[model samples]
Target: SLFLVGERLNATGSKRFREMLFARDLEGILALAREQVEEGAHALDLSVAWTGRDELEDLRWLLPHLATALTVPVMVDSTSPEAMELALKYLPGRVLLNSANLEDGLERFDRVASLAKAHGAALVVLAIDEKGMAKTREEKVRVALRMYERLTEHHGLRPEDLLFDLLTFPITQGDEESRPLAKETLLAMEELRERLPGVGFVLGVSNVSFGLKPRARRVLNSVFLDEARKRGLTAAIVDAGKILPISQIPEEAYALALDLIYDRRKEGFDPLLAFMAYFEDPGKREDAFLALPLLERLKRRVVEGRKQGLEADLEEALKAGHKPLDLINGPLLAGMKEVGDLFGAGKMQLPFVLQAAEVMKRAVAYLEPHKGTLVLATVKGDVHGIGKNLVDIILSNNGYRVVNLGIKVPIEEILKAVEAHKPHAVGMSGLLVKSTLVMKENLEYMRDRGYTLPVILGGAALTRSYVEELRAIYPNVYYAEDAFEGLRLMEELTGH
Candidate 1:
């Protein structure tokens, strides 16, 4: 049987969970832990590290609360040695240390292994070194071999006591550089299984399908987990509820996922494109929702959170003599309102809402291709996109049309978009401190040119005070702490 380590209960992943932690909602946190364990998680991986909080302080409180209540093993997931060392003392029994890597050099690796040894805990070693993450099979195996020797020879860890994490990048990143990564990870695992006997393999199983829609993610994760299991994956860090048995996944979906993961590329065939079309294409779908009236079908698409056949439905609505803006501001908006109300009443989950948003965006873009009242982007010199993208999803799903210019956007580019799209508001996001400075410079340029649209600033580098200071540069400036706050501000700015 494969060991399943629950991957939630971490601050970085879930914003709601992070809020619960910040508010000291111990019971709520415990409720999450209990739910995962009930869902068949063999162990729970607890990570409390966040941007503003002290890891050591969180570990002190969170560790003992979980240690006393839970029966299964806990995996202390943190990068800080001091935090891990402190946590090991609080957590009794043989818990697994989330990871150690060679990224910083041998001192940290040796220190991490020593902590695991002192606590009699199993260690998860990452295939990383000073050169950064292992991208190829050779790099992965080489890094693992060096770490393996150090653990067994120097650190006195038995082969059975170690769990090697041959890292797997997202297969959804369809660039040529990323296409071969999943294959590399699996191939590296095969070689390592033969080279290092008795040691188990571990992976953050959900990452194999990162950036996909929830439905797609579920299918791809299940398939990847199944494939990795065949290649000697002994334990997986996963959301236990999401990991379905291989038999449960659809046969065609599994084959498509396998074709992509295994790099089965040939003449005039693209697995990634096929996989995407299988889930996202609108023309190939025929469902019960198809028989409804045009406007009703439009509303149902958003309400049911169905993306497939949405474009065709919209096309029909257009040909049937409906204006794009009227359709968008009418039935499409009505459908999203239903989803929002249902979600507010706790009848829906965030993932489903996000899925609905994607469909809503597709419908709106199809109806009104180039016009969005709000323009969103990450400032130039920063490649961070998650925060900006989240804002797009929230605003789009809530019936706000917004032009989303993706990451690393320059000031001139933003101004060019403003000139072309003529949006009502501008939302800028950046994760780096330097990017925040770049944001300031961009604002100065906008002020000099007398562009006074409401500018909403956010990301890890920003604070309420920072936005306050930026208000001096531009009067119509606002601060959004998260995506929902961005939506609230967008509504305020547009008076909608």
Candidate 2:
């Protein structure tokens, strides 16, 4: 008896749907909603918020339409209080507020709770606060319990009116600390269920399997849902069509999914790696690797981080009249490119990417040379340069000669290097938040001075949206989420 909230009507998630919302395509939106209901969604979740758009107006227009057409409740997913209040007032039938969090302190919660109370709308409270996402069972329980107390005692809401989102993170993350996230979420849910009986537990279920391949995602999501249900999960925001019954999943995949969710690790064993490797081929990976073309084999060497037969393959290619630079640029770099793409796509982890880089370095060294020159730096006021250095290694190993200007590189030094090296691209990276501002000023300075060379930006603090904003100031700006993405962008920019 789980209440499945269909999650497809999200404007933030689908560009097409956002367009539909923009155009007031009510028929198309209703068609999508009917499909989710037909597939067994107990309620439909709707998120229409987008950057620079009128979220309040969108809800004001659409909520009225949904009230008449749908039998099930609508989960109004938005952060704007005005928007939420509008939905609560105008949207007919029962409505669920997508969220109320402790991030802004109790005053905000009291207001949200008051609105929910006034409208008789159920509220989804996230186990998160100003300190950020609650990661452990204890933190989650504490935050949730505190919120629960506020709602029941002071706000006059019943336990059943509250749905706690325990906050699930991606299980595909590489760090050891992230391995136990699903486990922690499950434990937190169990404890919350005991503490507040009849209260609902909800999750954005697909988040648990984020970054895995499609088939693996279905199995993991299904398994996680099954396990969560056993532990008193009463509802989930998910694609009803995708959630398979536990009996339908393949046995090995089911087991692997369980192991991954529960953090089944040993002294030196990694469940995540094992899970990835299992789905990478299921069994025929070795055969597939061997059957690939010689160039592909060379690429595979770097991707698989196996330098064992790489030299022999390079020697064979050379004997077959292929030039050393061609081998470095064509196959070795191709392998590193594959590594980068996989890492970017979340199919491969950072440690594996580093290993692949090491293999790429050795192969390129064997070739005795390295494409387009790049002037690189970690922008002013940001001393951190691991990301910058990684980009330098990735680019320098793969036919590009990098003029690494190193950490805390000011705009003056970067411009000097660009002039001195006459490089094909300029790369800047930073890890600190304030360095983003420094990078902005650096870009403005470069643009003012009329430097139109493609600027590759990467770091912990940068976002694609922020980089897009930078593009308005400087047209040749590109954002790289990681070193490999930086390499790919450089190749694209210079056509190397």
Candidate 3:
């Protein structure tokens, strides 16, 4: 059973502490205890010292309130024996006295240890002498043994009533010297366990690795714990108690499974990629349509497989399907258009954007074989074709026989195409700040010339504000951010 020390919730604590006190409210303390217990804490330790107030008075006020609120045992902690004694009276369950130290004058020891026994509470004895902590392991052990003897013989306390703390120094400041003290302390505890088998051992685990890098501290502390367990050390006072058990699992198995699934999905078709590929070729339009449902099915299966830890099952979903072009122009392109619109409105994240792009690219590639004889090009003097190509793939993949006049196409050639094939829609794309103005001029000229065909313009350079401005000047000109948006807007304009 795990017991949490609610020291963190106590207001007068460390710099890292978050204050949870509500004006000395005991009900709040009890509520916190109940919450911790529900989250798997078996017991609570009441800390009153960090409040920096009169210790005895605070304990006097806090103990009974806590007793009435909690059903689990409470450990009384105080540097003052009087406060400890007062706290013990109201404690509802078994009590464990926070500490006794050899340095606190033997008279003080007799006082607290005697009070503990009188109140039916167990005693925690720290291995320190009057001057300070014992410098050597032998000195520490001698002090601990002396206290053990005095309590048992003079105080008449049972061996089981005592808990010994083998003082572990902070390794960060003491460096290598602390290692010997730790090893000797453990050796002494081992000897004690063998000699007096009933006595229990405890340590403030935080002391050993204090001020060290977290990883180094954790690793060394874990090693020390494993060693201490072998030597019969039972209790530890440490932060991050929740992580200790979890660290024991084999991470390799979990990591490998995650990697396998991630790799499979990464290698598999991307809706955006398929759509992009489909836009590059026009002949594969029908096939690109055919691939949509299959690609969507693959995406759904990959997600489900990842959730269920079935990487191999997800991999199987990547088996050969319809031409990538059909997948792109139909489902992938359409799906992504919706995604892009959501993304533009801040409804979706970058992951959705990338996914849609992948699906579109793969669909374009599948449709490459079926592409018709058409010229695909971005507007004049514009180096950007990725966006335009994206639209081209959607149209071509959807079987709109297209001639892509690559970027920087002359207006005469565009007009010549209109006169020749009389295509359903004249799609234009650009990404430059100045290109949108050029596109506007082209639209206005066509309108003035009595060419009533639908015109679509799309690019990152055109924002809602810019599009609205352009629309005011040329009411028939439509603007989109990508190929899919352009396609939909064109369809709406042409009433197709």
Candidate 4:
């Protein structure tokens, strides 16, 4: 109701948050949520995106866990329809869905509409469509207005459920042609107030000062908030973890902010961008680096999925009398799990997932002599291997000797291989819409052979409810929403 959404837990900005997630640090997640609440956030915007993470699976657990503790509702910000549905299922009371846009028009919008109808939740409809984000006030208003009609008139959502985000841009890029962003937004807000008074509006306060110092960013943000609120911007997605009142910041900063917003300062008078440029002299945030432990630092590198320091960190951990297994189960697994969870949350994308998977491979190769042997392969006729290969590397690195049969292998061949290898477990992954049926058929083949050996099912298109039905006949059947969950199951099954 207060219309403030805390943005700290998102995968984009803070490095610590990403690492904390992979580590399964629930206490840390709660602490941050609690902190935001205490700081006066009316609601929280949760993102599950991290590279290669299954966004749908993350939302299933995250929404329930966060909702159980948090009194306030959450805003599920995700691009996945399945993720949105799962969030609606797990969200207690009622919650908000962060969007439906013109990208797929009402085709996808209808999918999201079902979620809103089920939960009676509000929405944050972006003015962006497939064409691109709206650039001018006219474009923003037109898109938002068109969006409003479809949601309320067609989708049956109440007018109050829609919150139009008149997107904000940073004023850091100073040039003659490149002008201030806030001025356009201000006009848009004022115009929106008159044209669509019933429609609610929101802004990202931080965007106004993007690429500026913390103090300077605050100055610009506060000014924008004050200016925006006066003109009918009722809500904002902001850093609700600290004091945001206008009185706290100094007037001089506001003066600079006003100058920037109005484009009052001459062409050469840009302290905002120039001030930010000064940070280049600093090598890094030395204080933050000195603060985190080696395990955490390593985990962050994994989530970031960068190869910059993987070799050195693994070497150091080994030299410190840490076994390769401990490193895998603890720091490495923790990081991979965090990355997977974040991806499930919709904060990490595939590139990062792909990169992080490679990072996991680097760590595993360095560890060497990984334990146990298992068959990991995608079902026949499924071309998608993004999910399968990721799991293959994560399990292998942690000590499993995976017999990856590659993709599109026939069920008969899988059975033959299973009989030949006689491994401890068999994992079948698929991604096509029809792959679930293929998985079911594969399980039936196992039953035909009277084989009840341990089996794991994983895929991009698979759902919990999908695999749950075949469980009666195939007792060892398990569904891993993502690769990390598969690893956890393997640990439980093999005691490895």
Best-fitting candidate, measured by TM-score?
2
TM-score against truth, every candidate: 0.63, 0.71, 0.46, 0.55
Give a tens-digit lDDT track for model 1, residues 371-445: 248888888646556557666768866677878888777889888988998888888898755567787888899
Clash pairs of candidate 2?
A: 371-399
Cα error, candidate 1, residue 382 (Å): 14
- Candidate 4 lDDT, tens digit per residue, 1-496? 3478888877545566667776777789889888888888888888766643566665665666887789777888776677888777777786888767765456777788767876898887777765556657778778877877788777788776777887777666432333555777788889888887677787877877754546556667777788888888877889975335777766666566677776676666654533333332245654575467888987876776557657877787888999877988788778888877876776654445655767887887888654566788888656555467667766765567789897777888887888888888899987655567778888887898899788988875555765677786687888887777887788888775
lDDT of 3 by residue, 390-415 (tens): 56655653445667776568677888
Q: How many residue pairs clash in each candidate?
A: 1, 1, 67, 18
Q: lDDT for model 4, on a 0 to 1 scale?
A: 0.73
TM-score of 1: 0.63
Candidates ranked, most accurate by TM-score first:
2, 1, 4, 3
Off by over 4 Å in 2: 267-269, 277-298, 305-332, 341-484, 487-496
lDDT of model 3 at position 398 = 43
- The TM-score measured for candidate 4 stands at 0.55
After TM-score superposition, the amount by which residue 164's alpha carbon in candidate 2 deviates from its true location, in angstroms, is: 0.8
The order of the candidates by lDDT, greatest first, is 2, 1, 4, 3
lDDT of each: 0.80, 0.81, 0.58, 0.73
Q: What is candidate 2's lDDT per residue for 1-496, written digit by digit as tens?
A: 6899998898866566778998999999999899999999999999987644567888888888888899799998876667888888888678899878876577667888899999999999988675557889999988988888889999999999999999877777454656898999999899988888979899988988875677778888888888899988989998888888888877877777888999998875567776776665445666787688897888788888775566677777888899887877688777777887777777776546655877877876777854689899888655554467667766776668999887767899989988999999888887655567788898899889988888888866566898889888999888777777777787788775
**Residue 407 miss distance in model 2 (angstroms):** 20
